[PDB]
């Protein structure tokens with residue numbers, strides 16, 4: 001019936017391929033042509049907390065999957081699903097005979113465990129991941145039969161199929177009950193004895209160490225953790241390693257239109273590189289079969305990238321980024337700097353800071369003129385376009401900026417020429433940045449010089465990714481620089497407009513913590529944010545598309561009125577590459593986190609000619 005990769009003939013112990021596949025495997029139509037088996041996919045990740053590079057290469061294996069044009073989703077791990085007319089009850093039919101990577105059955109037992117015993121367990125997650133919540137309230141997940149599972153939300157949830165296609169929506173398929181139950185007190189009477197083995201002190205830490213989460217490095221650091229991924233870890237991430245190797249999953253659950261069990265490619269090899277510049281040189285020498293993640297936003301190197309295409313044996317292709325802003329200033333409304341906070345919370349202060357910026361210079365210098373000035377709003381083709389949110393305060397007006405700061409009472413000056421607070425102290429903002437992000441650091445250096453003309457001091461504090469996230473969650477920053485999503489993905493990724501993302505809504509993560517705990521932790525936000533949060537809960541629970549359109553447009557307008565985050569430039573074209581020998585890469589796919597790119601292009605059907 002079906003066939004398998006020749007390298008699998010080398011494992012005597014494997015059942016015949018028809019018995020490893022579901023009775024009805026998901027048939028994957030290829031991007032361009034039917035493929036052939038073999039080869040090793042060479043790509044790259046960074047050394048510091050870059051496990052999402054693996055996830056965005058092999059792809060989240062969720063209940064649904066985006067179409068190539070990201071306009072809709074289709075059943076993926078689920079064979080099919082039905083929705084009740086009121087959008088509250090979702091019933092998923094699973095593929096009979098489907099198996100985990102260890103050969104054991106993948107059934108509704110696994111999805112019910114993942115939801116009820118892990119995701120929805122409040123000791124595991126004191127705040128339930130919001131992907132599964134409606135207005136902060138959880139669904140009831142129940143087994144219908146071995147191959148049918150039901151989600152019952154307490155209100156309409158029109159967007160749940162889209163959520164289930166994003167990386168943060170993939171919990172339902174991430175936890176094998178058999179393996180993970182040994183680390184759960186509800187199942188292992190002796191789970192305590194597992195703590196000393198893993199050097200943890202409680203079972204949630206145990207569960208994270210052994211069974212992982214969406215973005216934890218532990219997801220890729222063991223070989224024994226079962227999954228339904230197209231490739232499995234063989235040489236793990238985590239240690240002081242310079243290379244990660246994944247190998248085809250003999251129990252992968254898909255075929256191509258001729259009946260070949262996928263993936264076509266036998267192995268993936270990630271170079272784990274300590275420094276950016278080395279990635280650039282190896283890429284320009286053709287050492288990577290695909291790179292469409294780390295080098296996409298470095299306009300400085302596309303001349304050499306383009307130049308060495310023929311010598312390196314690769315093709316450069318452009319992608320449209322979903323981000324509204326390539327490098328935006330998240331201003332901390334809950335900055336611990338008491339003197340600064342009195343001005344940070346004033347609209348006109350933030351407006352002055354934006355008017356003192358010269359986005360044409362940033363474009364020219366940091367982006368070789370290939371980006372364009374923008375704040376944080378959706379693009380004009382978006383049904384969510386808001387002119388004010390996109391274009392207010394974009395033109396340099398130093399005189400106007402200085403007049404505002406004068407009017408706010410920052411008219412005293414120190415010996416170096418900077419403005420001071422009325423009661424002493426230089427007007428100074430600390431900006432945290434990831435040191436490996438060259439365009440972002442360069443953006444802050446240009447802004448520092450620009451804001452000096454307004455008598456304001458910007459202080460650059462660079463670190464690797466871990467400490468950068470640690471400082472943010474500690475509320476230890478005045479500014480954080482990173483992308484503003486929303487150009488194309490505003491409802492999937494609304495972090496810049498309302499403080500709902502626990503790690504990335506950095507107008508205040510204490511505000512987000514307040515929202516995500518029902519006001520039990522964190523810092524109560526101001527009236528405009530509490531208003532947007534209430535509207536956001538109404539939007540997620542909207543009964544009709546017209547109500548959802550009205551509600552979310554209200555959120556964007558309030559966000560525009562408030563002007564809480566300051567954009568520099570919307571992204572230039574994303575520069576990606578793949579080997580000329582690598583076939584079936586969708587060179588037209590958009591770029592972005594909610595689609596896990598480049599894995600949106602279905603890497604299980606990439607192949608080498």
Ligand SMILES: O=C(O)C1=C[C@H](O)[C@@H](O)[C@@H](O[C@@H]2[C@H](O)[C@@H](O)[C@@H](O[C@@H]3[C@H](O)[C@@H](O)[C@@H](O)O[C@@H]3C(=O)O)O[C@@H]2C(=O)O)O1
Pocket residue numbers: 052053056215293294295296297321323437482483504574591592593
């Ligand atoms: O080289 C870069 O630094 C870079 C290239 C991308 O072209 C650019 O859009 C930007 O990627 C952002 C973000 O800076 C990067 O850290 C990563 O973040 C996502 C997600 O947004 C985060 O919330 C977290 O989940 O980690 C993710 C990850 O992939 O690690 O990717 C985004 C993006 O747009 O895809 O930086």
